[PDB]
Amino acid sequence: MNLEPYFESFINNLRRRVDQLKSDQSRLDSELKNMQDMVEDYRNKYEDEINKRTNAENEFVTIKKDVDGAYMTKVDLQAKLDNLQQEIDFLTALYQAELSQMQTQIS
Amino acid sequence: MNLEPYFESFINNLRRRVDQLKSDQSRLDSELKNMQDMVEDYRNKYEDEINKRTNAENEFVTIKKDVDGAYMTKVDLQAKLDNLQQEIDFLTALYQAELSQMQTQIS
Amino acid sequence: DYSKYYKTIDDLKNQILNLTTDNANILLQIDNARLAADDFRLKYENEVALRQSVEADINGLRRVLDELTLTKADLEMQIESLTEELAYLKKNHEEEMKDLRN
Amino acid sequence: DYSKYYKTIDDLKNQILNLTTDNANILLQIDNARLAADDFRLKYENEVALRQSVEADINGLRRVLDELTLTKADLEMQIESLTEELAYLKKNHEEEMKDLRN
Ligand SMILES: [Co+2]
Ligand SMILES: [Co+2]
Ligand SMILES: [Co+2]
Ligand SMILES: [Co+2]
Ligand code: NI
Ligand code: NI
Ligand code: NI
Ligand code: NI
């Protein structure tokens, strides 16, 4: 008979396709592992950075509390100054009037 | 004596300051309430919109699952076509060889 | 009496201080309210823009699913025409054998 | 024998199908991996940009706290000079009374 040689030809073409598919596989294994390494990197950058942002949130809250308090004081004190000065002006003109009155008073 | 008129003057100036402070207060009451109304608005826009985004996340996951499956099939079927066609070509040339051999065979 | 004028003035001083501080407190309530807003705002802006991005990527997925099922269907029909071509070649050989038995 | 060549060919067909599907599966693992990345990326970008914004607003708060304590100190010193001016006016009046007793 004489069937094989053509069988052999076709099998060789086949073994070609399988060889390519194995090489492809390996490559995709590597690219996958590399993408996983990257995924874990990005995940860590994320987690780490939400810890960073949250501790910054807290630092902010504290400084803002200090500011709020200090505005409270400043307006309190400024108001008390306004009181003292206004009282000064008043008392000056008054005391001038006190001397004026005592003086022109029947002894 | 004659102390009052100056007292009265200063008290009137004072009553001026207090009147202004009361008006200010009222205004700040209103602006605060308005800012709270706005705060609740922005909070609701937020909450509502994270529900919106999350249900969109789910819709996405589902469609992507369907796509993944369908790629899986397509490559499976395409591969099976590749098989059938390759087998065709092979079988044609072979059968030509089968007739060639049968023919030139000692009867 | 002189003293009574004094007493009023003092009462009124204390009122000014109470009202001044009270106003200040309210204002601080406002500033902190603004800030809280701004936080919720930025947070919402980012949530929205995200929802949008995901929905658009979804538009992409729709497009590729549509074309993909088109290609699927096409291939299926070609598998039918090819399974056919196969069978017909089988029969050809069978008839050649019918010649052998002759 | 003829049949054995057939048997190999079939084994090898099945291998191609197993390897083709296996590759496809891996690829899908990759695409989904890329996507998961992109999610974590955008999420991180927004977390960072936020941290930055809050720290800069903190810079603002530092500036206003600094100037604010400066103003506080200034006012305090002025309260001292004014409480002084008050006391001195009191004494002036007292001496006027020392004239009355004369
Ligand atoms: Co492997
Ligand atoms: Co009120
Ligand atoms: Co009060
Ligand atoms: Co397998
Ligand atoms: Ni904020
Ligand atoms: Ni054809
Ligand atoms: Ni995504
Ligand atoms: Ni002066």
Resolution in A: 3.0
Please report the sign of the dihedral spanned by the C-alpha atoms of residue B79, residue B83, residue B89, residue B92. negative
From chain A, the residues in CB contact with B94 under 8 A are: 3, 6-7
> How far is C49 from B49, CA to CA, in rounded Å?
10
CB atoms under 10 Å from CB of D20, counted, come to 22
Q: Which residues in chain D have Cβ-Cβ distances shorter than 8 Å to B76?
A: 17, 20-21, 24
Who contacts C22 (Cβ-Cβ below 8 Å, separation ≥6)?
B25
Which one-letter amino acid corresponds to residue C67? Answer: E
As a residue count, chain D comes to 102
Q: How far is the CA of B23 from the centre of ligand 8 (A)?
A: 30
Which residues in chain A are closer than 8 Å to D29, comparing Cβ atoms? Answer: 32
Q: Which long-range contacts (CB under 8 A, 24 or more apart) does D59-66 make?
A: D61/A60, D61/A63, D61/A64, D61/A67, D62/A63, D64/A67, D65/A63, D65/A66, D65/A67, D65/A70
Phi, psi of C54 (to 5 degrees): -65, -40
CA distances from A90 to B3, B5, B8, C78, D89 (A): 12, 12, 11, 107, 11
Give A45's contacts in chain D (Cβ within 8 Å). Answer: 40, 44
Residue B88: count of CB within 10 angstroms of its CB? 15
Closest CA to B61 of D36, D45, A101: D36
Q: Taking phi first (over 0 means left), then psi (-120 to 50 degrees means alpha), and beta for anything else, what does residue C66 get? A: alpha
- Of all residues in chain B, the one with the smallest CA distance to D30 is B68
- Whether B50 and chain C come into contact, CB under 8 Å, resolves to yes
**What does the alpha-carbon distance between residue A62 and residue A66 come to, in Å, rounded to a whole number?**
6
On whether any CB of chain C is under 8 Å from the CB of D53, the answer is yes
User: What is the Cα–Cα distance from D92 to A95, expressed in whole angstroms?
Assistant: 9
> Looking at chain C, which subunits does it touch, using at least 3 CB pairs closer than 8 Å as the criterion?
A, B, D
The identity of residue C87, as a single letter, is A
Query: Which positions in chain B touch C20 (Cβ < 8 Å)?
Result: 21
Query: For the packed helices A4-103 and D2-101, what is the interaxial angle rounded to 10 degrees?
Result: 0
What is the C-alpha to C-alpha distance for residues D18 and B75, in angstroms, rounded to an integer? 11
Q: Which range marks the domain in which residue A48 is found?
A: 1-107
Among the partner-chain residues D26, D64, D92, the one whose CB lies closest to the CB of A67 is D64
CA angle at residue D5 from D4 to D11, to 5 degrees? 85
Which structure tokens are listed for B41?
């608005």
Q: Please name which of A31, C62, C51, A43 lies closest in space to residue D28, comparing C-alpha atoms.
A: A31
Select from A18, A67, A77 the Cβ nearest to the Cβ of D16.
A18
Ligand 6 centre to CA of D14 (Å) is 23
CA B39 to chain centre: 23
Contacts of C24 in chain A (CB under 8 A): 71-72, 75-76
- Chain-centroid distance, C-alpha C62: 16
Look up the domain containing C17 and give its range: 1-102
Inter-chain touch B6–A98, beta carbons under 8 Å = no
Q: Where are the alpha helices (DSSP H) in C1-102?
A: 2-101
Going from the Cα of B52 to the center of ligand 5, the distance in angstroms, rounded, reads 24
Contact check, Cβ <8 Å, D16/B79: yes
User: What's the total number of domains in chain B?
Assistant: 1
Tokens standing for B11? 């008290």
A19 within 8 A of D16, measured Cβ to Cβ? no
Q: What's the CA gap between A16 and D25, in Å, rounded?
A: 22
Distances in Å between the alpha carbon of D80 and those of A79, A95, C13?
14, 22, 19
Method of structure determination = X-ray
| Total structural domains within chain D | 1
Dist CA D5 CA A12 (whole Å) = 12
Alpha-carbon gap: C102 to the closest alpha carbon of chain D (Å): 24
Q: Which of C16, C68, C100 is facing B67, going by the closest CB pair?
A: C68
Question: What ligand is nearest to the CA atom of residue B92?
Answer: 6
Q: What angle do CA D63, D68, D72 make, to 5 degrees?
A: 155
Is the CB of residue C86 less than 8 Å away from at least one CB of chain B?
Answer: yes
Tokens of B101: 């051999």
Identity at D41, one-letter amino acid code: R
Which residues make Cβ contacts (< 8 Å) with residue D3, sequence separation at least 6? none
